[PDB]
Every structure is written in C-alpha cells, then in structure tokens.
Amino acid sequence: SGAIYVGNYRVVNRHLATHNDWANLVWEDSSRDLLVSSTTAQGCDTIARCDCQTGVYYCSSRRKHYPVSFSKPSLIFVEASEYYPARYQSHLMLAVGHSEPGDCGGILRCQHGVVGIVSTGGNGLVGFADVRDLLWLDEE
Ligand SMILES: Cn1ccnc1-c1noc(C2CCC2)n1
Numbered sequence: 001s002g003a004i005y006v007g008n009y010r011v012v013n014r015h016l017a018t019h020n021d022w023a024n025l026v027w028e029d030s031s032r033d034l035l036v037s038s039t040t041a042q043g044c045d046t047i048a049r050c051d052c053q054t055g056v057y058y059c060s061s062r063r064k065h066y067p068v069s070f071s072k073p074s075l076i077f078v079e080a081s082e083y084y085p086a087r088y089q090s091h092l093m094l095a096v097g098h099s100e101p102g103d104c105g106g107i108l109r110c111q112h113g114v115v116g117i118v119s120t121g122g123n124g125l126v127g128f129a130d131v132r133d134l135l136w137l138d139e140e
C-alpha cells in the first residue's frame, strides 16, 4: 500500500483504490494501474518533471529505501500477479530490486521529487507506474 498526496489529489494503484477513491474519482487508467481521487486536506508531495533514470524507492516488504537505476516509462508485458493477470501495462519503469504485491504504492523519488509508485514485482524486478507525464497533478 501507499499513495502520492500532491495538491488535493491522492495517487494510488488502481487495483488498491477504495470505495472512497472511486466515489471521489478524478482520473483512472487500468493500463497504467493508476487512479487519482480528490482530497479535502492538501498534500506534502511534489512530482518530478524529468527524464531521470536514477532514484530511491521504498520497499515495505524490507522496510528499506533502495537506490535504483530504472528504465524509461514504456509498454511492458507483466507476468500474472495475485492482483492482476499476465498482461501489458503502459508507462511502466523497471529496475532490479525486490517488489512483492504489498510493496505496491511505495514511492520512487529522484532529485526532482516523486517519480511514481511500485506497481509490479517478481523475478527480481520492481515496476513503477510513472506519474511524471501527468502535468495536471501540478494545478487545479
Ligand atoms: C479528464 N482527463 C482525461 C485525461 N486526463 C484528464 C484529466 N487530467 O486532469 C484532469 C483534471 C485536472 C483537474 C482534474 N482531468
């Protein structure tokens, strides 16, 4: 679990969205595993606007932050997970590192702020849902 809190937006894994997130829906995309909902209190997070391929992500299943190199956001085939089938996911960035299903929502951050959240795992890779293309998170 985990979320990005930017302005009055809450960014979560679409597969972990609550009834409240769906009841207060701003934007969702099953092919990115991303859902954004509206918040009452404003958020502490800034969004990276950058093409950085180095950063640090939180791994809840290790209680650790790991510096990683990661691929640019792409359309990637992902093997079946306990929360999704074997399928293509878009705007996905891969690095070498530990990602279990409960790691989804852990933040990946660079020198420019929040890059994305853990979305995929297994075979010693960790996939992140990029949010740096979502410029609209930075206003309204
Ligand atoms: C409707 N739509 C479709 C694709 N992207 C959007 C979207 N992005 O931001 C928003 C507005 C910004 C304030 C909430 N909608």
Ligand SMILES: [Zn+2]
Binding pocket: 048, 049, 050, 051, 052, 110, 111, 112, 113
């Ligand atoms: Zn950056």
